[PDB]
Symmetry: C2
Subunit: 131 residues, 2 copies
């Protein structure tokens, strides 16, 4: 399995896949896939080198950002569900999966983020409960 | 992005990711990530070098197969929602995504599969429609 096949495996992923490096208090993105651009509504040019905190908008009082911050500082994987907002403003429920990985090229730990949209299932459970 | 990061991105994927090659009427597997092992219940040793039609079991009557065979022969991506069964026999709705790709290393057309489990979503919508 070569890097070309691996790259196309990433581009064919249903969930969004991003890679982010740490720059102090903010971890900025260095790679986004096509699934991330359609999920968030942003393009690769306007999403690189910026922390993914913009997806949270002003909904900054969530339990996930705290567990995410603690796990990354300790090199621990974590999975949290966050309420994020697209460029248009639509709110989508994101089952984010962060995995710190060690790049042997520069011996720098990078962070991989898998974004899965579960907003449709959350709306189903709420609608069935109201019935 | 180097090849080590791309491999870690595949191993961290929630959905199952596999790579298969064409061997006539069959399309045997050559790579299986950890997600495909937990989702299908079959180990890498069992699922390798065999076509993925075994997940269908006895439910081989699905119109998605003819659409899959058409897309792979015409080198076109395809997505189908099929009824597959794990090793325990528990049925699960698999949103399969096949993307034919040309490996420049050997000029052989490989096929990338993305298995997404949507079992409960189908159950929830079915429960919603019956209540409506
Ligand atoms: C690789 C990676 C991907 C991330 N993706 C998202 C995301 O899609 N949505 C989100 O709300 N936060 C995401 N985050 C988390 C934020 O970027 C940020 O690091 C986190 O909210 C830290 O909270 P803080 O603002 O208190 O420091 C991601 C983090 C990493 C490292
Ligand atoms: C990479 C790849 C992954 C596949 N994964 C599945 C799968 O998970 N479940 C399934 O029912 N069919 C899967 N298929 C389709 C079957 O392997 C097979 O091609 C299809 O069922 C047609 O079989 P047939 O020739 O007997 O009609 C996959 C095909 C490819 C190329």
């Amino acid at each position: 399995i070569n890097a070309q096949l691996l790259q196309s495996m990433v581009d064919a992923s249903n969930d969004g896949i991003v890679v982010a490096e740490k720059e102090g208090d903010d971890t900025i993105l260095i790679y986004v896939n096509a699934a991330f651009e359609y999920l968030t509504g942003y393009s690769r040019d306007e999403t690189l080198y910026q922390d993914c905190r913009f997806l949270q908008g002003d909904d900054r009082d969530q339990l996930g950002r705290a567990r995410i911050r603690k796990a990354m500082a300790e090199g621990r994987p974590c999975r949290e569900v966050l309420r994020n907002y697209r460029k248009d403003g639509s709110a989508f429920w994101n089952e984010l999966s962060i995995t710190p990985v060690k790049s042997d090229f520069d011996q720098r730990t990078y962070f991989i983020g898998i974004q899965k949209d579960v907003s449709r299932q959350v709306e189903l459970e709420r609608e069935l409960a109201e019935l």
